[PDB]
Amino acid sequence: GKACPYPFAEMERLEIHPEYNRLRDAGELGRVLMPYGGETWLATSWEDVAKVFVDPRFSRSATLGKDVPRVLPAIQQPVIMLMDPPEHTRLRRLATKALTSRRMEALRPRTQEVADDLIDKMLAKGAPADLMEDFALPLPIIMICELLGVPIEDQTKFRTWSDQMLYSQEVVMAAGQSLYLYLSELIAERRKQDTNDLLGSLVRARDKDDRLSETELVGFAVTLLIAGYETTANAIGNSVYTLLTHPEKLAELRKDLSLIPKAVDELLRIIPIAKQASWVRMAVEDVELSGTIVKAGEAVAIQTHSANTDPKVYDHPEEIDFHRTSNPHMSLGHGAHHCMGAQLVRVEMQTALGSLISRIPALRFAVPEPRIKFLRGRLVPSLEALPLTW
Numbered sequence: 001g002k003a004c005p006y007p008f009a010e011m012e013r014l015e016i017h018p019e020y021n022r023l024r025d026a027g028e029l030g031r032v033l034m035p036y037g038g039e040t041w042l043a044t045s046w047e048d049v050a051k052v053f054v055d056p057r058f059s060r061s062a063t064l065g066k067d068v069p070r071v072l073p074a075i076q077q078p079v080i081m082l083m084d085p086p087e088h089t090r091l092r093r094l095a096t097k098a099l100t101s102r103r104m105e106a107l108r109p110r111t112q113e114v115a116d117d118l119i120d121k122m123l124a125k126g127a128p129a130d131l132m133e134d135f136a137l138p139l140p141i142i143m144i145c146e147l148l149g150v151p152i153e154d155q156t157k158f159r160t161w162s163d164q165m166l167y168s169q170e171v172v173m174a175a176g177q178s179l180y181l182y183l184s185e186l187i188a189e190r191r192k193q194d195t196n197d198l199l200g201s202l203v204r205a206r207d208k209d210d211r212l213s214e215t216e217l218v219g220f221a222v223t224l225l226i227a228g229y230e231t232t233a234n235a236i237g238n239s240v241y242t243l244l245t246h247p248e249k250l251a252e253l254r255k256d257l258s259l260i261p262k263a264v265d266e267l268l269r270i271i272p273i274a275k276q277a278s279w280v281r282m283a284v285e286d287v288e289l290s291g292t293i294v295k296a297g298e299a300v301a302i303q304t305h306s307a308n309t310d311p312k313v314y315d316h317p318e319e320i321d322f323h324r325t326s327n328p329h330m331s332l333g334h335g336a337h338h339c340m341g342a343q344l345v346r347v348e349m350q351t352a353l354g355s356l357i358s359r360i361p362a363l364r365f366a367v368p369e370p371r372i373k374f375l376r377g378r379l380v381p382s383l384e385a386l387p388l389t390w
């Protein structure tokens with residue numbers, strides 16, 4: 001047992017274990033033992049982490065139903081993000097035609113209404129309130145629903161199931177099938193009314209004579225929903241808790257808002273998007289990675305935080321600066337698996353702070369900052385409550 005047990009981290013708050021920044025600033029490649037599957041390499045530098053996303057000598061296809069190192073015991077499922085060419089660069093090519101940077105910016109108007117909408121009842125109801133449930137937690141579902149085309153009537157019955165996928169199996173997989181068949185149904189309707197919708201234009205999207213089949217269509221559909229619900233809530237709620245930890249940095253925004261774009265990529269990079277590392281990638285060829293030489297069939301996991309705070313790429317890398325002349329962060333990913341939610345995450349977080357920071361200037365923690373509790377759950381860090389007062 002050269003390799004330390006990965007059960008080493010803790011998601012107490014938005015803290016990261018020091019190993020990541022010792023390994024980066026010394027041992028190119030570090031080795032740790034995952035509780036399930038074997039042991040695995042741990043890339044931590046900007047250099048290596050960038051590579052693990054982009055190097056075709058790193059298959060993620062070759063993880064479908066394999067005994068690979070991991071943190072969960074569930075063995076993952078043919079998804080856009082466990083594919084590789086030519087299947088991935090075909091699926092994603094067809095989808096990106098419907099899920100354009102245009103369509104997602106055109107959502108900004110609606111997204112305004114919805115933030116305004118939420119602080120409105122949130123203000124109306126009286127302080128103290130709790131932003132996770134009260135405003136950040138729904139904003140992104142209401143925005144995902146609008147994107148796909150989920151009609152107003154079915155909207156509150158969508159949240160029914162979409163939140164039944166967290167607490168049993170005879171209700172989550174009920175909620176599974178209940179949402180598969182609901183979406184497959186809804187797509188059928190967009191083929192009838194060939195809309196200016198996203199489900200509308202995924203059908204109508206064709207590369208030469210290629211098209212998405214019922215199970216690629218529904219499969220892609222459902223994947224947005226899971227990608228964009230729980231991680232846009234947590235992008236927001238945390239980013240606030242952080243912004244509120246640096247009042248220095250609020251006033252700079254509050255009494256200036258031309259920086260909302262630049263401050264979001266900033267607030268992303270600085271904040272860990274997960275409590276553990278990533279979904280271990282598999283070397284299909286021998287590739288020297290950050291000094292050490294990953295043998296083919298050997299596994300490696302990317303930590304983004306350490307990449308995003310690499311003193312080799314970021315000057316003053318642990319201070320928050322909204323004036324950074326350039327921000328090549330990894331929080332939203334790199335290469336041909338660039339987050340396709342990207343444009344929407346930016347227009348959501350911008351206008352969500354864009355609003356809150358103005359519409360509630362004197363918005364402050366209700367309870368001592370130390371006393372705010374985080375979920376002892378898993379995957380990415382979540383806020384039990386974000387109790388605020390005004």
Ligand code: HEM
Nearest residue numbers: 080081224227228231232273331332333337339340341345
């Ligand atoms: C709001 C709607 C969102 C949608 C619809 C969405 C969808 C996706 C999809 C489909 C991918 C995989 C792309 C591919 O392999 O072809 C992706 C990647 C990614 N998304 Fe999102 N996303 C969203 C928001 C976010 C947010 C808020 C975060 C916050 C951290 C995030 C983090 C990531 C990361 C890190 C990747 C890297 C993919 C990889 O290399 O494995 N996404 N997103």
